[PDB]
Coordinates of all heavy atoms in Angstrom, one line a residue:
Chain Q
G9 N -8.7 -33.8 27.0 CA -7.8 -34.8 27.7 C -6.7 -34.0 28.4 O -5.9 -33.4 27.9
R10 N -6.8 -34.3 29.7 CA -5.7 -33.7 30.7 C -4.3 -34.2 30.4 O -3.4 -33.4 30.3 CB -6.0 -33.9 32.2 CG -6.0 -35.5 32.4 CD -7.1 -35.8 33.6 NE -6.5 -36.8 34.4 CZ -6.7 -37.0 35.7 NH1 -7.6 -36.3 36.3 NH2 -6.2 -38.1 36.3
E11 N -4.2 -35.3 29.9 CA -2.9 -36.0 29.6 C -2.5 -35.4 28.1 O -1.3 -35.2 28.0 CB -3.0 -37.6 29.5 CG -3.2 -38.2 30.7 CD -4.5 -38.4 31.3 OE1 -5.2 -39.2 30.4 OE2 -4.8 -38.1 32.4
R12 N -3.4 -35.3 27.2 CA -3.1 -34.8 25.9 C -2.5 -33.4 26.0 O -1.6 -33.1 25.5 CB -4.3 -34.9 25.0 CG -4.3 -36.1 24.1 CD -3.2 -35.8 23.0 NE -3.0 -37.2 22.2 CZ -2.4 -38.3 22.9 NH1 -2.0 -38.1 24.2 NH2 -2.2 -39.3 22.3
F13 N -3.4 -32.6 26.6 CA -3.0 -31.1 26.8 C -1.6 -31.0 27.4 O -0.8 -30.1 27.2 CB -4.0 -30.5 27.7 CG -3.6 -28.9 27.9 CD1 -4.2 -27.9 27.2 CD2 -2.7 -28.5 28.7 CE1 -4.0 -26.6 27.3 CE2 -2.4 -27.1 29.0 CZ -3.0 -26.2 28.2
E14 N -1.3 -32.0 28.4 CA -0.1 -31.9 29.1 C 1.2 -32.0 28.2 O 2.1 -31.5 28.3 CB -0.1 -33.1 30.2 CG -0.5 -32.6 31.6 CD 0.6 -32.4 32.6 OE1 1.1 -33.5 33.1 OE2 0.9 -31.3 32.8
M15 N 0.9 -33.0 27.3 CA 2.0 -33.1 26.2 C 2.2 -31.9 25.4 O 3.3 -31.3 25.4 CB 1.6 -34.4 25.3 CG 1.1 -35.6 26.1 SD 1.3 -37.1 25.2 CE 0.7 -36.6 23.5
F16 N 1.2 -31.5 24.7 CA 1.2 -30.4 23.9 C 1.6 -29.1 24.8 O 2.2 -28.0 24.2 CB -0.2 -30.1 23.2 CG -0.8 -31.4 22.6 CD1 -2.0 -31.8 23.0 CD2 0.0 -32.1 21.8 CE1 -2.6 -32.9 22.4 CE2 -0.6 -33.2 21.3 CZ -1.7 -33.7 21.5
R17 N 1.3 -29.1 26.0 CA 1.6 -28.1 27.0 C 3.1 -28.1 27.2 O 3.8 -26.9 27.3 CB 0.7 -28.1 28.2 CG 1.0 -27.0 29.1 CD 0.9 -27.4 30.7 NE 1.1 -26.4 31.6 CZ 1.3 -26.5 32.9 NH1 1.5 -27.7 33.4 NH2 1.5 -25.4 33.6
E18 N 3.6 -29.2 27.6 CA 4.9 -29.4 28.0 C 5.9 -29.0 26.6 O 7.1 -28.7 26.9 CB 5.3 -30.8 28.5 CG 6.6 -30.9 29.3 CD 6.3 -30.8 30.7 OE1 6.0 -29.9 31.3 OE2 6.5 -32.0 31.4
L19 N 5.4 -29.4 25.5 CA 6.1 -29.3 24.3 C 6.2 -27.7 24.0 O 7.3 -27.2 23.6 CB 5.3 -30.0 23.2 CG 5.8 -31.4 22.8 CD1 5.4 -32.4 24.0 CD2 5.4 -31.9 21.4
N20 N 5.1 -27.1 24.2 CA 5.2 -25.6 23.9 C 6.1 -24.9 24.9 O 6.8 -23.9 24.6 CB 3.6 -25.0 24.0 CG 3.7 -23.5 23.6 OD1 3.6 -22.7 24.5 ND2 3.5 -23.3 22.4
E21 N 6.0 -25.3 26.2 CA 6.9 -24.7 27.2 C 8.3 -25.2 27.1 O 9.2 -24.3 27.3 CB 6.3 -25.1 28.6 CG 5.0 -24.3 29.0 CD 4.6 -24.8 30.4 OE1 4.7 -25.8 30.7 OE2 4.1 -23.8 31.2
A22 N 8.5 -26.3 26.6 CA 9.8 -26.9 26.4 C 10.5 -26.4 25.1 O 11.6 -26.3 25.0 CB 9.8 -28.3 26.4

Side-chain angles (χ1 to χ4, degrees):
Chain Q
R10 57 205 219 162
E11 285 97 55
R12 260 289 162 292
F13 180 105
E14 269 256 286
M15 316 204 312
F16 315 125
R17 181 214 185 198
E18 199 101 293
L19 266 71
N20 184 266
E21 285 182 321

